[PDB]
Structure formats: structure tokens, C-alpha cells
Amino acid sequence: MALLGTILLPLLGFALLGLFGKRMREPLPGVLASGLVLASFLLGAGLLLSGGARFQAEWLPGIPFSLLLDNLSGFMLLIVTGVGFLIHVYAIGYMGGDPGYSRFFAYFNLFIAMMLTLVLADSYPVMFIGWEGVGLASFLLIGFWYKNPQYADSARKAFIVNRIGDLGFMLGMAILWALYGTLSISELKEAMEGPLKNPDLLALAGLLLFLGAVGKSAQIPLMVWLPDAMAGPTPVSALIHAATMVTAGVYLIARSSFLYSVLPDVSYAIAVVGLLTAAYGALSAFGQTDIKKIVAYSTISQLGYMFLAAGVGAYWVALFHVFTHAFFKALLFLASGSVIHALGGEQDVRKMGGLWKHLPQTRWHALIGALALGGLPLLSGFWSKDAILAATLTYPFGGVGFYVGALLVAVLTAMYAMRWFVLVFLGEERGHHHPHEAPPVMLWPNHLLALGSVLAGYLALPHPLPNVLEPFLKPALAEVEAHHLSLGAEWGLIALSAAVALLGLWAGFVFFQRKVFPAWYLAFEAASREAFYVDRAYNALIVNPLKALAEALFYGDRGLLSGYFGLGGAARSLGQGLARLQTGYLRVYALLFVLGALLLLGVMR
């Protein structure tokens, strides 16, 4: 019963800021939002320290309302609430003189409550409730500034793709209702152990769950909705790309780890899709001339990393990368938001450069972030990415090509992160920034974000050093394990990864200080800026043809109604022929009369 308050607080707060909202001073809505996030973080950490929580209430027959708070659920809850409080403070800072303070922080509270509903669920229908709520809050916050059409169609496309993924989710859930009839993840796992049945249908349900997870975490093909979230304010982009709305993809697999652990083909496919998503997000990252896009594509790349980890069966490793990423990407985004608040929303890369000396603590934030993304040898991003690299080989399904693939993707993440940092802070000066570059309450939670990004790190370290995260994650869920391991050679691999990451950092440094950009690289950068022409083909054969088919069906319905009219007119015509049967000549009437009478007398036999 007390567990419900964690969700209720940034729902009552959302209701206040939505309904009255503007009856308050400017800081007060953000203050209330951040305070509810804080006094929900605290009261949920108390429950986690009390061993766990359970809640069951009456709902749809056979589908009750079941909340389970365990190790795996609490890990996600603490991540989301902490980063949400930090981004709430950063949004109190970043939002100023902008109407709809109430709307913004009510939407923030709503987002927090919906993400909590998602992660705290013992039933797949409650998981789906949280899913659609997060999608709605994302649409709302991306379309917060409605006076611009650009920042509305973005959210529209986002939610449409999201509802595609949610329909796949629903179909998988109908499968895992027709099959078992529980739809409560706990009893569904306990019913799925042992003699599995209809393996084709089970793999199909798992595949549909993964299809939903792809739409949510912006994997291929449904990736395209994530970059346009730049339309949303920068703290919104931070919360969406780092702590929420994407992590749910990995969480669904980790909770369904019992389901996917017995689906080798499905887990292999998940690994393949994660690899391809990382490769794309990395290749199309640096060509982007906007900081928001060049960071969003890195988000896509790192989410591909996490999905590869969870696909090879390395669930706790995927969660490790989720942790490190939620730190350093929030760092990146809030740094970028402070940058564009200093330049008055310039939000460009080629219009940037030489912000090193002029910006105090922002060069430090952005550098810590870029190094965590590139995998600095002693940094959380390094530990997570390389734990993924190791779990590739150690965990089942072979990981042979996946290892070299993820290594090249790490090279590219280093290169484009260095392109980001170079082109933003170094090697020319352009524009204007007079008064105020660094604000207090934006960089203050960003300070803690840089701190956490640096020191997330060593919670999961190769087995001589303590792997604290794995024993925490394994017992609550992701129970089934089959992983080999090695020593001496594994640390040689760690050394190879660290050296390669350093080489990629300096390679990006030189290549993107260069500005030479030889013939082929210009084409490559342009292609990466245009996201490799994906939307062009999506609207060529899919979206616009669906529109034309909608119009065609409308015209077909019109013609159907016209045919109904034609039938009525045929009846009328018959009627007027029968009225023409009466000419008005008495001889005609009498002949027709005698005719009808003889017809009757014949019928009588």
C-alpha cells in the first residue's frame, strides 16, 4: 500500500501543475516536482532496504494489479528517480521566462510516474500500461513548445512508431495469455520453467515482446523516432535518451530473461539487432552538424550495445552498460543544454568552436562526458562497454564476429565523441556570448552527474576485482545462467580495448581538428548528416502509400454509397415501369385484369 505513494506523488504534483499550475510563482512548480521526486526516491530506498515490496489489488478478472519490488526493479527505480531529480533541478535552471513552467514540470512528474508504473510490475499488462504512459509523456514533452510545427510532427512520428511497438507487445501478450492464462510475470516464469509448450508460439511471443522493445529503445528499423526528440527541450532529451524510455527495452528482456534464455534463436537475433543498431548510430553520428542529433545517434549506438549484451545472455552486463550510460549521457545532454543556453539556443556545430576558455566547468563536463562515451580506460563507460565485449565471448551463441564488431563501434564512438568535443569547444571562434554562460542550478546537478559518470565504474569489475553488480542482479531475475570465463587472456583483451579506445580518441581528435576532410570523407559526413537516407525510403514506399490507400478506401466507400443509391434507383425505375403498366386505356386495364385472373386460376392447381 505504501509502495503506491512513489507513483502517486509525481501524479498529484502533475495534477496540481496541470490544473492550477500557473497559480504559482515561476520556481515553485519545478521545486515541487523535484521535491516529490526526492521524497519518492527516499521512500522507495527505504522499502528496498526493508527487503522488498509486494502489492496485489483487484482488477480485470484473471489480470489483477500486481506490483513487485525486488533487486532488479529497485535498481531501475533508483537510477530513474536520481537522474530524474537531477534533470528536474537542471530543468528548474534551464527553463526561465518560458511560459508553461507548470506544463513542463507536470509533464515531468507524469513521465516519472509512468516510468515507475513500467518498471514496478508483476504483470505484463501493467508493464504495457507503463509503456504507453511513457510514450505519451514523451510525445507531450517533445511537443511542449507547440507554436512551432517542427516540434510537433516529431512527437507525432515518435508516438506512431511507439504504438507500432506497443501493438507488437499486445500481440505477444495475447499469445502469453492464450498459452498460459496468467500474464503475471512471476507466475508466468514459474509456469514457463520445465516442459515448455508450443515452442514456435513461445518464440513468437518473445519475438513480439522484442519488437515492442525495439520501438521503445529506438532500435532498427524503428530507430528514426529518437533523433527528432531534439525537438523537445534539452532536459527532456536528456531524460528520454539516458534514464527512461529506452532502458525499458533492455528491462523487458531482463525480466523476460527466463523466456529469452530458452530462446536461443531469439537471443541471437537480439544480439544481431543490437550490433547493427550500434553500428548505425555510430556511423551516422558524427556527420550530424547538430549537437542534439550527434548525441542522439550516440544514444542509439550505446542502446545497441546494451541490447547486444542482453541478447548474448549477459543481462547483468547489459544493465551495467545501462547504468554507466544513464550517467554519462545525462551529463552530455545537460552539458549541451547549458551550451545552447549560453549561445541563446544556437544548437549547431559548424556555428560553434573555441568554447574552451570562455566556458568554465562546461569544458570539464563535456570532456568528462566525451571520455566516458569514448571509453576512457578508467571510466564507467569503459568498464561497461568492455564488460559487454567480454560477455560476448564468455556467454553463449559464440560472440565471434560480435566482438570485433563492437570493438569497431567503440572506435567510432570515440571518433564521433571527439568530433563533438572538438567542433564544439576548439579551433575557431564564432558568434556571441556576453553575460551569463554558467548558471548555478544547471551545472550544480551536472557536477554530480559528472561525478557519477566518472565513479560508476568499479561496481562491476573483472572477477579478481569485485563484481558487485552481478550478484545483485542475478538472484531476483535473469536466473538461468550458462557462461564460461577465463583469466590472464581476459585482461589482455581489456588492455586491447583500452589501447584501441585511446587510439580512437586521438584519431577523432586529429581527424576533426584537421578540417581537411578528404574527398570520400565529405560524402561520408554528408551521408551521416542525412542519417543515411532512411526517412526518404520510409516515406517513399510506406507512409505516403498508406496515405494514398486511405484516400483510395475513402473513395471506395463513396462509390459503395453511390452503388446503394443505384440500387434504390433501380427499385424506383421498376416502380415507374409498373406505373407505366397503367396506360389509362380501359381496354388495357381489362386485358391486364383478365390476364391476372387466369394466372390465379392456373396457380390454384
Binding site for another protein (CB under 8 A): 18, 58-61, 125, 128-129, 132-133, 136, 139, 143, 146-149, 152-153, 156, 159-160, 163-164, 166-167, 170-171, 173-175, 177-178, 547, 549-551, 553-554, 557, 560-561, 564, 568
Q: Least separation, in Å, of the C-beta of 173 and another protein?
A: 8
Q: Least separation, in Å, of the C-beta of 93 and another protein?
A: 25
Burial class (CB in 10 A: 0-12, 13-18, 19+), 156: middle
Yes or no: say if 301 and 541 are a contact pair by the CB < 8 Å rule. no
Yes or no: say if 218 and 303 are a contact pair by the CB < 8 Å rule. yes
How far is the first Cα of the chain from the last one, in angstroms, to the nearest whole number? Answer: 84
Residue 216 or 321 with smaller CB distance to another protein? 216
Q: Least separation, in Å, of the C-beta of 556 and another protein?
A: 9
Q: Least separation, in Å, of the C-beta of 60 and another protein?
A: 6
Residue 93 or 143 with smaller CB distance to another protein? 143
CA atoms within 13 A on the CB side of 569: 6
Residue 61 or 518 with smaller CB distance to another protein? 61
Residue 114 or 349 with smaller CB distance to another protein? 114
Residue 54 or 547 with smaller CB distance to another protein? 547
Long-range contacts of 557-566, Cβ-Cβ distance < 8 Å, separation of 24 or more: none
And the C-alpha cell for 11? 501524479
Q: Least separation, in Å, of the C-beta of 163 and another protein?
A: 5
Alpha-carbon radius of gyration of the chain: 30
Residue 485 or 561 with smaller CB distance to another protein? 561
Yes or no: say if 316 and 372 are a contact pair by the CB < 8 Å rule. no
3-state secondary structure (DSSP) of residue 69: strand
Residue 561 or 588 with smaller CB distance to another protein? 561
Q: Least separation, in Å, of the C-beta of 136 and another protein?
A: 7
Helix-helix angle 27-49:71-94, to 10 degrees: 160
Residue 161 or 359 with smaller CB distance to another protein? 161
Grid-cell match 564544439, residue found: 424
Nearest to 57 by CA among 115, 11, 126: 126
Q: DSSP secondary-structure letter at 456?
A: S
Q: Least separation, in Å, of the C-beta of 57 and another protein?
A: 9
Residue 185 or 334 with smaller CB distance to another protein? 185
Q: Least separation, in Å, of the C-beta of 178 and another protein?
A: 5
Three-class secondary structure assignment of 537-559:
HHHHHHHHHHHHHHHHHHHHHHH
And the C-alpha cell for 501? 579506445
Furthest C-alpha separation in the chain: 118
Residue 492 or 545 with smaller CB distance to another protein? 545
Q: Least separation, in Å, of the C-beta of 570 and another protein?
A: 14
Three-class secondary structure assignment of 363-405:
HHHHHHHHHHHHCCCCCHHHHHHHHHHHHHHHCCCCCHHHHHH
Residue 168 or 405 with smaller CB distance to another protein? 168
Residue 129 or 340 with smaller CB distance to another protein? 129
3-state secondary structure (DSSP) of residue 75: helix
Is the backbone peptide bond immediately before 221 cis, with ω within 30 degrees of 0? Answer: yes
And the C-alpha cell for 143? 511537443
- Rounded to 5 degrees, what are φ and ψ at 514? -50, -50
Residue 133 or 311 with smaller CB distance to another protein? 133
Q: Please name the residues in contact with 419: beta carbons below 8 A apart, sequence gap of 6 or more.
A: 286, 294, 508, 511, 512
Q: Least separation, in Å, of the C-beta of 197 and another protein?
A: 16
Q: Least separation, in Å, of the C-beta of 553 and another protein?
A: 5
Q: Least separation, in Å, of the C-beta of 232 and another protein?
A: 14
Alpha-carbon distances, residue 464 vs 341, 347, 467 (angstroms)? 45, 45, 8
- Rounded to 5 degrees, what are φ and ψ at 179? -70, -60
Yes or no: say if 237 and 90 are a contact pair by the CB < 8 Å rule. no
Q: Least separation, in Å, of the C-beta of 100 and another protein?
A: 10
